[PDB]
Subunit: 110 residues, 2 copies
């Protein structure tokens, strides 16, 4: 088993870039795919990144996923922030007998 | 290209067994693994079921995943219902390689 640790929240201005990171506590981050989910409270989550850095159809190119083996973390970078981007972001990966989610990062667009 | 439709709300008394459906709009429900996530207020989702009926350790056997091919859907059944089970439940599967989520179901324990 392992944990995916990410900041409770982060704030940034519209038009700017923000990076939300997810650190895996044990085992190598590159051991399994990392997904990034966007959820606006009251609605189901939406996949913005799957398999570390692949954006599904219909997701703006302003979203990009990356993996950093040196820090054993995954990052979601959102450029040109739009108000609509305000939402909670959860990273997720696979362990052995479970799917583990990060605590989620509340992104506030000032 | 498909959607995973679930009932918006479901309610049941404590102690009883509640079933939450997840219906795939197109393509066989059994052609890709279905996961079930439990999301309590202001917190992160947790996996209660993965690969159709697998329970990670920690999750009570009170939760069970199943597949009904006649209604092309997956179901999460929760027995010994407790007020603590109240939360939003999301089913999830794969379209190509993308992760598709169900609309979600608000489970209220009328108790």
């Amino acid at each position: 088993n392992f944990m995916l640790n990410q900041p409770h929240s982060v704030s940034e201005s519209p038009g700017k870039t923000v990076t939300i990171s997810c650190t895996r506590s044990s085992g190598n981050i590159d051991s399994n795919y990392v997904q990034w989910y966007q959820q606006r409270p009251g609605s189901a989550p939406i996949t913005v990144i799957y398999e570390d850095n692949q954006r599904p159809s219909g997701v703006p190119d302003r979203f990009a996923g990356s993996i950093d083996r040196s820090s054993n973390s995954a990052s979601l970078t959102i450029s040109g922030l739009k108000t609509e981007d305000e939402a909670d972001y959860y990273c997720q990966s696979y362990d052995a007998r479970n799917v583990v989610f990060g605590g989620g990062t509340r992104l506030t667009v000032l």
